[PDB]
Design a protein around this ligand. Structure first.
Ligand SMILES: [Mn+2]
Ligand SMILES: [Mn+2]
Ligand SMILES: [Mn+2]
Ligand SMILES: [Mn+2]
Ligand SMILES: [Mn+2]
Ligand SMILES: [Mn+2]
Ligand SMILES: [Mn+2]
Lengths: 191, 192
């Protein structure tokens, strides 16, 4: 894909748009009582056997990017999202491609309280798309284990849809979770 | 990994033992009202960023391979499992390996009702290991989409722990969900 501004992407004609969101909350939990979780980051296994972020297509002639995302988040993540307001303030980036098809992808990042993310996971099973478009929700491991591979580097060898891996890596840098050198180390160990 | 009898494996001192289980249930659901789900098969995202089946290390001097499995299932999947039977009749295969620790793995396949699986997924959030060892449950796509890659072939390109991928393909044949040529077709399509 190619980087584009929101305003520029919204002036385009004959492009399909999609919105996807990273929902996250801080955690005081420690794996094996020693390895800090740091933060809960939500992704999903999709119907197509690839990992991704919740969200989907939006017809911007009908509804705003935010309204489209909202509807798609309720379908995929479930009832608990009616208490969540992902707004324009949560918008981060847009990327554009022309092949195979003209598509713009918008990426949102929204911090929640831990209890809020926990409620989302608990009610995700009740989503309209559970066991269909959505095959399950997963947390992203942020740590690297002692073997220097387990955790995030191994996670990054899974199968990701579209530019979702790049969006994840963007969030990690954006949220100041990992330094640039740390991101490169994680990608080296992964490959 | 190498195939080994259950009877032979327990008499092999110095080896560590682990037990893992495929819990599954039939389904009448259709993806996009078109592609039959056929069956719900449970796997998980692990703390280590790999996909696997629920279960884990079982001390053989402690109790039976069944008992060690049942406690891990409750630990990983939650309190719903206390009610789930589990028996030697659910045992399927054992694999032994030397490289990277001496390890015997036992594979279990148990068919449940769809409601039971649904209840399991719904209370998984309550499991001692949710958000720790277990990063979330997932269902396995059994179908292949029109592009001939999406669904099962794409799913098999994920990162699988140990021989869990081998184990899954065994189950797909074992439960007669795919023939051998069909399995060979998804593996090539996957690796392409
Ligand atoms: Mn979607
Ligand atoms: Mn959707
Ligand atoms: Mn949609
Ligand atoms: Mn385990
Ligand atoms: Mn365990
Ligand atoms: Mn453990
Ligand atoms: Mn254990």
């Amino acid at each position: 894909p190619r980087n584009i501004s929101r305003e520029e992407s919204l002036q385009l004609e004959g492009y399909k748009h999609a919105c996807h969101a990273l929902l996250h909350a801080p955690s005081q939990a420690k794996l094996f009582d020693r390895v800090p979780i740091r933060r809960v980051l939500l992704m999903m296994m999709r119907f197509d056997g690839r990992l991704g972020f919740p969200g989907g297509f939006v017809d911007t002639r009908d509804i705003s990017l935010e309204e489209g995302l909202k509807r798609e988040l309720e379908e995929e993540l479930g009832p608990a999202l009616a208490t969540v307001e992902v707004t324009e303030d949560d918008y981060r980036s847009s990327q554009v491609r022309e092949h195979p098809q003209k598509c713009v992808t918008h990426f949102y990042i929204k911090e929640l309280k831990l209890e809020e993310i926990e409620r989302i996971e608990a009610e995700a099973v009740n989503a309209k798309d559970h066991g269909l478009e959505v095959m399950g929700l997963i947390r992203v491991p942020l740590y690297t284990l002692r073997d220097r591979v387990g955790g995030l580097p191994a996670f990054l060898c899974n199968n990701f849809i579209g530019n979702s891996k790049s969006q994840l890596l963007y969030a990690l840098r954006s949220l100041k979770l990992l330094r640039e050198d740390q991101i490169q180390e994680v990608l080296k160990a992964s490959h």
